Design an enzyme around this catalytic site. Structure first.
Site, PDB file in Angstrom:
ATOM      1  N   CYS A   1      19.476  27.448  10.363  1.00 33.25           N
ATOM      2  CA  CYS A   1      18.748  26.862   9.246  1.00 33.25           C
ATOM      3  C   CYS A   1      19.358  27.268   7.909  1.00 33.25           C
ATOM      4  O   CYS A   1      19.350  26.484   6.953  1.00 33.25           O
ATOM      5  CB  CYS A   1      17.270  27.256   9.312  1.00 33.25           C
ATOM      6  SG  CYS A   1      16.395  26.390  10.642  1.00 33.25           S
TER       7      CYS A   1
ATOM      8  N   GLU B   1       8.355  27.908   8.660  1.00 35.65           N
ATOM      9  CA  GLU B   1       9.770  28.186   8.433  1.00 35.65           C
ATOM     10  C   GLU B   1      10.476  26.947   8.965  1.00 35.65           C
ATOM     11  O   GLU B   1      10.760  26.854  10.158  1.00 35.65           O
ATOM     12  CB  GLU B   1      10.217  29.406   9.242  1.00 35.65           C
ATOM     13  CG  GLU B   1       9.542  30.723   8.866  1.00 35.65           C
ATOM     14  CD  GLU B   1      10.130  31.348   7.611  1.00 35.65           C
ATOM     15  OE1 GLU B   1      11.253  30.959   7.217  1.00 35.65           O
ATOM     16  OE2 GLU B   1       9.479  32.241   7.031  1.00 35.65           O
TER      17      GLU B   1
END
Ligand SMILES: NC(=O)c1ccc[n+]([C@@H]2O[C@H](COP(=O)([O-])OP(=O)(O)OC[C@H]3O[C@@H](n4cnc5c(N)ncnc54)[C@H](OP(=O)(O)O)[C@@H]3O)[C@@H](O)[C@H]2O)c1
Ligand SMILES: NC(=O)c1ccc[n+]([C@@H]2O[C@H](COP(=O)([O-])OP(=O)(O)OC[C@H]3O[C@@H](n4cnc5c(N)ncnc54)[C@H](OP(=O)(O)O)[C@@H]3O)[C@@H](O)[C@H]2O)c1
Lengths: 455, 455
Positions: free
Chosen positions: B262, B228
């Site tokens: 993010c 991720e």
């Protein structure tokens, strides 16, 4: 070098030229543009029709494709025909399941509307082994072709004709150039492909050494991978095993493809009371083997794929014996030009003997003796591999309970290994990670694109 | 070194010592034995009750856990409380879904009976970032704990108190020692953990550099991974966007956690007709920012997580301007010991500008101008990232159609990012591969063990 050397006569039949750097660049760009075309425009129906046509052509010219595999790596022509049939089954399966497998997935939530699309991701690199020249390719090509991921293939050095003919097969079926392209490249070029921005994933089937090298390069470039490695499958015979059925599967379980199968029944685990009975039964079975010309319908044992393969199996047998193992049967050299190794049975294996933990990609039966079911489970799990395995028992619920305790990815009840389009194939530990086939293998390289609309 | 340095005062609060080689070895052995215990005996119900207890404790002591995150990396206390609430939901979700998610899955085959079990594989290594100290951990701990995979954690060097207290939380919930263990180790020790045979998988959330290092190490050791990584999400405003609704989400979309998300809305893509209007609006929203003590419920803008973080953002802003970008708002230093960066907005970005392709982990709004929907899509896809993104449109059908054309893992309609237990989270390209949360995240390190019984 990429060459076809008939394992039966050891004669060079074809020698292929490696792909140049410019050719490689052209192939990747063509594949990338094809990916964008399928990503922006829906061409699924055409791919479905094309994949069905691949299956039709394989049916029609089965014998031609079967002979190519035999001349490449030496497997029995009859086994090669069986391999083609399985490829036809896989191709038709994914063409039929396409619409279903690509359907968007609703997600349960009381906060809004949510679901995810299954989209293609890009060009996929496949690195495959020689033991099943066509099956190894089709396992990954069929599902990825349907999802829309163009593919580039790096096949084994000893089966170039199989690899080349597969590409021509897809083009003949009407697929656009770039759907899959064979690459006669070196290890360094494979590194360049994995590091190429147009390649988004790598699926490999092969040895641990090759897997570690490819996975390491993929990780460094942040590319997802799936690994299908070796196995040293345990074939466990419980106390209520039906020996009539047992005798019927033994030959296939260990001598199919001359034992060159990752899911071959390499480690037989038997109880004390059946130990002598099994040594005698396995010997009786191995004695029926008839080696010779793999094209001859009467031959029931092919020569190994290469001189090196034969040398390795022979050395492993020598190593086992030098460290205390017992030679139950065979072990005698075969005088013939081909890479023949006669069926051999070893027993008296102990944890201090190196072969106890090694995979032998040859016709070598291995017998492990245990005194209880718990001991059987312990031996089965005392392995660095975890691919397949067999549980032989007349009681289905019993077999199912024992199977669950085995640390492996696959368990076959009362039978040797089997591979079908609808069944997931893969293992754990040093056998790798990820799965091929079924719907599980279908999504290895698909992007689950979440769409969320809050209330 | 692992230290808690309050971002608001830049005062060192705690200093932790690194774990030793022996300590690490003891931890891996304990975790490995716990894996074996859970694999041999059924302890699912206890684990389910224990996970619910983790949720109850988080609920009960929410404020103490929240302040811990604020003192570690400086996020607003009110935001920190929100993180805790999400962690409670993630914990309860997997505890409740446990039975359903672990059920064996039948496989349709006409050759016999087949299905596959969802079994544990071993000890999992999690590497996490500081932006969401607790959420990042819970995302992977909850599902793996239920599965039966003991976990070892290597958290960010600036949030050690969060990492340590999370371990203490699980212990306090009644979970067995080893269910999860925090590791204050170096990068070299992380490589040793990945190479240890007792560790069977690695899930990392963080930067590309860290991701490449860990994935490369994992590949070399044949270990499965999920990554991720960052994002540079496009927030596309279509022609039929509801501007009243738009104004309500803008502050959150880019200034939440000071832009250190993010899935933060880093690239605003607006049409010519709306360009000037959006510049005014974003400027108006950004002017309402009140920076100061993050423990104060009056503050609406927190200081960045570290002095290095602040320095990087300021350099990226300078780099942008030095290459042609236009300063629309802010850009002036804030005099205060804390690592504060005032909301800044830039536009006039061109493909020739380095920042056009860089992720800015800070309160920096970026405006891209396009003339059509086609151009909006091209810009959104012209990125090395593909994590999230937003489509703003009053016509949901239209928004969904446009979202499908974006190359990314997630698309949020008429809203900034959101994360829920039932929603899969992850991306493509340099944003990584694999998914967390939902059912998809539940099976990342599960062994789908096939049981096949031919007729
Ligand atoms: O069964 P098997 O003996 O075929 O298993 P294997 O030795 O691992 O080979 C399986 C496939 O991986 C390839 N391969 C092995 N090591 C490689 C490396 N370092 N880089 C790139 N490709 C590599 C092999 O190519 P080659 O056949 O050319 O070695 C083959 O195509
Ligand atoms: O955002 P962000 O700044 O937190 O992203 P980040 O710098 O990549 O940090 C994410 C996580 O990965 C760790 N990490 C980064 N590079 C590493 C490496 N080469 N080997 C092992 N671990 C590494 C970080 O530890 P550290 O916080 O110790 O750098 C952190 O726990």
């Amino acid at each position: 070098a990429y060459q076809t050397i008939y394992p039966y006569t050891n004669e060079v039949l074809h020698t292929f030229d490696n792909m140049t750097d410019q050719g490689l660049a052209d192939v990747l760009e063509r594949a990338h543009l094809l990916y964008k075309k399928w990503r922006k425009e829906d061409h699924l129906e055409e791919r479905k029709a094309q994949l069905h046509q691949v299956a039709n052509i394989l049916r029609r010219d089965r014998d031609k494709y079967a002979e190519i595999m035999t001349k490449d790596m030496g497997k029995l022509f009859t086994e090669a025909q069986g391999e083609v049939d399985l490829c036809a089954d896989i191709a038709d399966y994914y063409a039929d399941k396409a619409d279903e497998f690509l359907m968007s997935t609703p997600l349960e939530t009381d906060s809004g509307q949510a679901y995810y699309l299954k989209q293609s991701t890009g060009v996929i690199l496949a690195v495959e082994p020689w033991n099943f020249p066509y099956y190894q390719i089709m396992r990954v090509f069929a599902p990825n072709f349907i999802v829309g991921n163009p593919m580039v293939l790096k096949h084994a050095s000893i089966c170039p004709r199989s690899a080349q003919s597969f590409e021509e097969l897809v083009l003949e079926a009407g697929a656009e150039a770039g759907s899959i392209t064979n690459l006669f490249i070196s290890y360094d070029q494979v590194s360049q492909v994995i590091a190429d921005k147009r390649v988004v994933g790598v699926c490999l089937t092969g040895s641990e050494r090759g897997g570690a090298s490819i996975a390491e390069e993929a990780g460094k470039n942040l590319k997802k991978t799936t690994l299908e490695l070796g196995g040293d499958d345990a074939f466990i015979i419980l106390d209520d095993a039906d020996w009539d059925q047992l005798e019927k599967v033994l030959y296939f379980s260990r001598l199919y493809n001359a034992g060159q199968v990752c899911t071959s029944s390499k480690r037989f685990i038997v109880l004390d009371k059946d130990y002598d009975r099994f040594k005698e039964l396995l010997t009786k079975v191995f004695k029926t083997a008839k080696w010779g010309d793999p094209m001859d319908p009467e031959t029931t044992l092919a020569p190994l794929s290469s001189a090196q393969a034969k040398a390795d199996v022979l050395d492993q047998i020598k190593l086992a014996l030098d460290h205390g193992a017992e030679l139950v049967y065979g072990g005698e050299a075969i005088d013939h030009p081909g890479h023949f190794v006669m069926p051999t049975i070893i027993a008296g294996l102990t944890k201090d003997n190196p072969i106890y933990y090694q995979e032998i990609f040859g016709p070598v039966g291995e017998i492990y003796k245990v005194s209880s079911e718990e001991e059987a489970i312990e031996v089965a799990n005392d392995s660095n591999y975890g691919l397949g395995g067999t549980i032989f028992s007349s009681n289905q619920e019993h077999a199912k309970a024992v199977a669950a305790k085995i640390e492996t990815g696959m368990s076959f009840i009362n039978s040797g290994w089997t591979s079908l389009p609808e069944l997931p194939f893969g293992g754990i530990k040093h056998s790798g990670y990820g799965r091929e086939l079924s719907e599980l293998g279908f999504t290895s390289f698909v992007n689950e694109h979440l769409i969320y609309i809050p209330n």
